[PDB]
Structures are given as C-alpha cells and as structure tokens.
Amino acid sequence: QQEAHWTINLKDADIREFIDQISEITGETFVVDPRVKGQVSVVSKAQLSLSEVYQLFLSVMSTHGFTVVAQGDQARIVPNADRLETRVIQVQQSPVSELIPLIRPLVPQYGHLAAVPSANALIISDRSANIARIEDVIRQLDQKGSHDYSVINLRYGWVMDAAEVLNNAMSRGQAKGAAGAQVIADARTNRLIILGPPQARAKLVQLAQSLDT
Amino acid sequence: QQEAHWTINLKDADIREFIDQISEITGETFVVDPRVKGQVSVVSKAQLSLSEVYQLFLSVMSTHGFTVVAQGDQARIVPNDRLETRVIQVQQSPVSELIPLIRPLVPQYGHLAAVPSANALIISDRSANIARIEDVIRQLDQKGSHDYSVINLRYGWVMDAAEVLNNAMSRGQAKGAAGAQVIADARTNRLIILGPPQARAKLVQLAQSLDT
Secondary structure, three states: OOOOOEEEEEEEEEEEHHHHHHHHHHOOOOOOOOOOOOOEEEEEEEEOOOOHHHHHHHHHHHOOEEEEOOOOEEEEEHHHHHHHEEEEOOOOOOOOOHHHHHHHHOOOOOOEEEEEEOOOOOEEEEEEHHHHHHHHHHHOOOOOOOOEEEEEOOOOOOHHHHHHHHHHHHHOOOOOOOOOOOOOEOOOOOOEEEEEHHHHHHHHHHHOOOOOO | OOOOOEEEEEEEEEHHHHHHHHHHHHHEEEEEEEEEOEEEEEEEEEOOOOOHHHHHHHHHHHHHEEEEEEEEOOEEEEEEOOOOEEEEEOOOOOOHHHHHHHHHHHOOOOOEEEEOOOOOEEEEEOHHHHHHHHHHHHHHHOOOOOOOEEEOOOOHHHHHHHHHHHHOOOOOOOOOOOEEEEEEEEEEEEEEEEEEHHHHHHHHHHHHHHOO
C-alpha cells in the first residue's frame, strides 16, 4: 500500500511538459495531437490527491481549449471546437463553498472558478495580475467566522458607481454603523454583495437600497 | 437576409435523431462515432437563435457523456441515464436574478446554466424533478425584487430552521415580516431569505437569533 499527494509549480512551460508531469503523476499515457501547443502557468501550493490532480489537469485543458477523449482504450488530447494562469488556493479557516459566491463576482467571462471540495481549495483561471488580486481577496476573506451576505440587484443605478459611493461613505464615517463591512461589485449581473458583521451589514443594505432611485 | 428561431420537442428519441435535428438547424455536418448511443429528452418552449441552439446541443452532449472535437477537418462526436433537458424562459426578471434561488434544488447528477441572450436556463435532471423545478421558477418569476440574504447555519440544521421560520410567519409570530420567503440548501447548510426589503431584514434578525 502507497498513497501520494502532489504540489505542482510550472510557470511559462510548454503544454506537452505539463501533460508529461500529469502522466508521470497519474500513471496514464496520453496521445497528444500534433496541433496541441502553448505555454501554461500552473501552481498548487496545496498537496493534491490523484483525483484532485486529474481535476486540475482537465481544468488546464479546458482553460487552454482542449478536451480528453477515449480512443483505442487510452486518452487522446484534441481541441474543443490570450495566456491564462491557473492557481489552486486552499481555504483554511472555513469551507470553500462559503467563499465561492463572494469571489465568483471578481471572475471575468474568459476566466474560470471551480471548487475542489476534497482538498477544500478552488481552481482559478485568469491573467497573472487578476489572479494575484483574487488570491489577496481570498487571503483577507479566510480570517472571518461569518460569511453571511446580502445581494442587491441594482436597476436604477450602475454597480461600479454605487460601490465607490458606499466605500467613500464608510471611510469618512458618513456611513452610520458600517465600520467593518465590505462591498463586492458584480458588473456582469449588475449586483452588489454586502458582507461583514451582522449589525454593520444590515445598515449597508438599508444604505444601498436607498441609493437605488 | 433571413434569420430563424427554433423550438425543439424531442421525447425519448435516439441521440443520432437529435444530432440530425441539430445539423438540419445549424447546417453543420457532424461525424458520429459508432459507440454513441442513447435516448434523449430535449424540450425548449422558447424560440432559440442559431447560437442558443448550438449551446443546447453541447449541453445535451455533455449531459449524456460526449464531446465535440474538430478532428480531421470536420466536427466529430466522441465520448468524454434517465435524464431530461429543458429550456425555461424567465418572463418578468433577468435569468441571473433566479439562478442563485433555484441552484440549491439542483443535484450533482444534474446541471444548470443560463442562456442570457434568450433569458432562459438549461436544466438537466430526472423527469419528476424537472417538473418540480419548472413550477418553482414559474412561482418565483411573479415578484419584482429578487434581492436576497444568506445565512450560513453553523449550529442548527437548515430543514428544521426553515420549518421554524415558516411557522413563525403564518401565525404572525414573526414581527413586521409579511410576504417573505425562506429557501433551504441542505448541501451547504444555509438559508436563503427573500421578499420585500423591510420584511426580509426582520427575517434575517429572526434567523440569526435562532443560530445558538
């Protein structure tokens, strides 16, 4: 009996190099189609089981526009008819499920986000600059006990403005009992996510609903 | 110039029959691998554009375990059981508003995704659960506001906590919180609070006090 857990750290390396690492990990030989090309950035500081490794492999394949098909009782890598980095961030002081609704709004159309519940981590696809930002958001989000939130679907306003309005109101103390509460803007769906301790969070909801006129 | 919108109604028909309907719609010839077999149930009461049709095709392919590849300079269907696929159009609010509210009633064996262009959603589940979810959406759509609050129960049990709140509202024991609703997500052990602002805020206070 022997069970291993892997940490992957590949930056700007070839796609065929990552597939090579994966096959050496999983023990599965893949047939790489000649048109398979590209440079991938894959980092996982969290130690992954065999399944969690495979999960991360398919994620990287989908992110870079390829798919795994079963031809002649072996896996074949063919394309599914910009450079995106991939990071596996482990949540330590709460279950991942709690964070997904909160970081999902900072993820674009080109980017992807999915949980690895077994590892209590999440896989993210985005640009190098946005990934360092989202990683920083997670890092700050993990500390808290409560991850209870409120959603405001704006109609009379514009989310980017409405949030800039609220953050200015909190900083100057013009927002009554709002010290310690956060605002997340989802431009895609035009909605606000309200966070922080119960008393504070409730006051921000009243404040933001009054701003929709 | 000429543009079309299709409505598909295929129940218990062969996979190769649906692929045939799709190719006749899209105008793209697909090469089916011999191992591709199965009976599919696909219904869309909402009229779909070419793109929205293709979206629905790939969804059905993923749901039944196949994938589309550009192999040999043509599109090929290769592999990546009582499932149905329905396209439900939301009439009053944008789909984005109702996805967080119905998503908890969707299992692992299923899948839910929005067609924002058609303001509809594609769901894969069993025939019995799909009829249930379809009438949940049909009831949820009527309202104006779909703003909501989430309570992550860290002590109690969601099924109980919700039954507790619904009883408190019916008898009027829940103060200034009329016309509000509670959604239970057992998987994540959390409560979703809905309804008019004033009412919804009172229920949040009521449900947070119940977590001890």
